[PDB]
Structure 1
Amino acid sequence: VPRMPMIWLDLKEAGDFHFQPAVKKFVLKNYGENPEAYNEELKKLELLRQNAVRVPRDFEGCSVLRKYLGQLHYLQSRVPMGSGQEAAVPVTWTEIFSGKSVAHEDIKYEQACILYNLGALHSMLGAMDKRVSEEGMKVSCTHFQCAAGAFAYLREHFPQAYSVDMSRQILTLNVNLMLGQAQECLLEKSMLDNRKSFLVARISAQVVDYYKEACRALENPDTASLLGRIQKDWKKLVQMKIYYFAAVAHLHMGKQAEEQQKFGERVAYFQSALDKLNEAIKLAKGQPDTVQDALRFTMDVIGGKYNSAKKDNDFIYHEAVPALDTLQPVKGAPLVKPLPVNPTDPAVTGPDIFAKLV
């Protein structure tokens, strides 16, 4: 079965964070020490920043970002570089949707951007994989949940947005899109694992529910205008997937009917699935071959099940085909959540770079 492609988020581009002079002055003025006595530590932090803002786009890249994020917390605990504080310096980053530089004299803006990039990087690692195996689906699911975790942490701990790409409404979209993709990975896995058809239907139904939340944000004219050109691409994929996974949910409810030997119910579910799938195909116009191939394969599957079921029923069982509205709807089975981040886990940060600054 050809898998659907996944959306990922680009990393923000960093400008300057000239922390050195401010740290040197605070050391002299507050700690009463030679301003130059911490050139080693400053040098280590600068090299770590350079590595993080140019992070390698791979799994090892995630630990570089976590290490730098943590060292930023350590530095803030020793030298006051927050909003309005004595040793604060300009921090500049590029806002994703506009490409404009946004500056704040606040080291927590630097932390927020780094956390954002950790989420973006996780989204890339999750979306770049081909998901051919159970393990691949599981690891991708984990990356999407880590991405959701980063964006949810940002959303919760940084309520006043430093820039619109990090505003509450946009982060909420990111979270729902990432949980949708995580749940989609587990749907694929549940099929590989041969779970009961009814359970597979609930899992797929929840994929639909997450994509519906994300689609709502994409359809929000205000939210949309913040995104710009990228709204159109994301919306097309998401809206198509809403119909696709609703069709998959009904395909599996029909499979349950087949197992229960309810041959009229079988027809009704497969008919609904075909209807939903046909809508997905209309919505997919212009989409890449990865999408077209997924849909073609599914059309062969659902079309075949439907014909077979309609034939068994028309020639043999002659059972009434229930009105869909007389069938208990499928409730989503949520299997995913945003995975928490501890920015100051000693395991990720290593020793405090400024441990000697006391």
Structure 2
Amino acid sequence: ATFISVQLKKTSEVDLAKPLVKFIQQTYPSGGEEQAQYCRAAEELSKLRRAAVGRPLDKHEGALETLLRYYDQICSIEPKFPFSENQICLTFTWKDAFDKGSLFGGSVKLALASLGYEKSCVLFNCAALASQIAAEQNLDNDEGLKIAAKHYQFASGAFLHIKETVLSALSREPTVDISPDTVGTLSLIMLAQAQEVFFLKATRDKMKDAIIAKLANQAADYFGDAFKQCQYKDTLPKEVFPVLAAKHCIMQANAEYHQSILAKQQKKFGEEIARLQHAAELIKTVASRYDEYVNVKDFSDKINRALAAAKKDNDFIYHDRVPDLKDLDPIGKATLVKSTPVNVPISQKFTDLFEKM
């Protein structure tokens, strides 16, 4: 399985409790039970940070909901202790998800006394965990399919939220990993993989080849635009560009292949041959260029078996003219996929620890 997922951002442990504890007892004089119970809920919050961003990595829904709860909580804490004018000192330290950093001294780290920056990197990890769970699904299983489609759309929409938001939410120029350009490209990639899940669902359910071709054609568009975003950049890991380039051509070929079954059904045998020749050319390009990244052997065979039978019978029986590609109609496009908006709360059965305030 050749799906792209994103590694989690690392962060050093922080004592969330103390800098809040003291900032509570300033505007809460009664140091006996009621108003100093926010100081115990602030203890649960520090515990939540360590649970969300501290634990050994769990590629499971349990870890994701923790991460999402913590995002939700941070959004609820921003008005309580007005963070626009700085009066609290709390410094979060996050390492860049992709930048190795020169081994000639230090990785790429950014420390910022900012709720804006923390919730950005948190949301990044929600997106990146969602992407990893999506990619580990069993796509030869209908619930596996449903999980992937759901997690890719979540993540896509979460990267997009950061894109729109990072600059405003931070004081400094962000790290590259969360900059709008990197995170806009990740968004598109997750959206591409979500579309491809719909094509795999449609294929599995043996739906109408016309529909299946339209969903593959739209996947090809999303994969095309993503690689063209990586073409002059070296931010993402080195497998990403060639996997996207190949999926672009793998998807155009699936589009042509399913369109050619529609054509055969309609007895347009010349057009079948023309579409199948297109698909074989595309797939031969991926086999020769992207052999390290994708295994395209059985599709090549399916296509070749079909092209050979098609030519034989056209030559012997039908004698249709094989059209030029530029004379064929365009395959349509069907998108079944969107970037899930981030509207807190995004966690299940969310309770604001500081809802009294």
Residue equivalent to 1:62: 64
- 1:92 is paired with a residue whose SS is strand
Structure 1 unpaired stretches of 5+ = none
Distance 2:119 2:214 in 1: 38
Residue equivalent to 1:23: 20
Percent identity of paired positions between Structure 1 and Structure 2: 29
Deviation at 1:226, TM superposition (A): 3.2
- 2:69 is paired with a residue whose SS is helix
| Match status 1:202 vs 2:214 | yes
Q: Greater helix share, 1 or 2?
A: 1
Distance 2:9 2:268 in 1: 54
TM-score, normalised via structure 1 length: 0.90
Residue equivalent to 1:180: 192
Between the two proteins, the alignment pairs up a number of residues equal to: 341
1:204-248 per-position Cα deviation (integer Å, ceiling 9, x unaligned): 01111000111011102xxx2333xx1x21111111111111111
Superposition pairs for residues 69-80 of structure 1, below 5 Å? 69-80=71-82
Residue equivalent to 2:2: 5
Residue equivalent to 1:105: 113
Distance 2:292 2:205 in 1: 33
Distance 2:252 2:183 in 1: 25
Residue equivalent to 2:148: 140
| Match status 1:305 vs 2:306 | yes
Structure 2 unpaired stretches of 5+ = 100-106
Deviation at 1:49, TM superposition (A): 0.9
TM-score, normalised via structure 2 length: 0.90
Query: 1:177·1:214 contact (CA, 8 Å) conserved in 2?
Result: yes
Distance 1:84 1:309 in 2: 72
Distance 2:17 2:40 in 1: 11
* Change in CA separation of 1:344 and 1:85 when aligned onto 2, cut-off 3 Å: farther
Deviation at 1:183, TM superposition (A): 0.5
Match of 2:234 among 225, 230, 243: 225
Deviation at 1:346, TM superposition (A): 7.9
Residue equivalent to 1:93: 94
Query: 1:83·1:106 contact (CA, 8 Å) conserved in 2?
Result: no
* Change in CA separation of 1:27 and 1:226 when aligned onto 2, cut-off 3 Å: same
Distance 2:54 2:217 in 1: 39
Query: 1:149·1:341 contact (CA, 8 Å) conserved in 2?
Result: yes
Deviation at 1:11, TM superposition (A): 0.6
Residue equivalent to 1:49: 49
Deviation at 1:264, TM superposition (A): 0.8
Supply the RMSD in Å over aligned alpha carbons: 1.9
Counterpart of 2:321 in structure 1: which amino acid?
Answer: A
Distance 2:255 2:348 in 1: 42
Superposition pairs for residues 214-253 of structure 1, below 5 Å? 214-220=226-232, 224-227=233-236, 230=237, 232-253=238-259
Deviation at 1:302, TM superposition (A): 0.4
Deviation at 1:152, TM superposition (A): 1.2
Query: 1:27·1:33 contact (CA, 8 Å) conserved in 2?
Result: no
- 1:332 is paired with a residue whose SS is coil
Query: 2:69·2:346 contact (CA, 8 Å) conserved in 1?
Result: no
* Change in CA separation of 1:266 and 1:226 when aligned onto 2, cut-off 3 Å: closer
Query: 1:123·1:147 contact (CA, 8 Å) conserved in 2?
Result: yes
Deviation at 1:345, TM superposition (A): 5.6
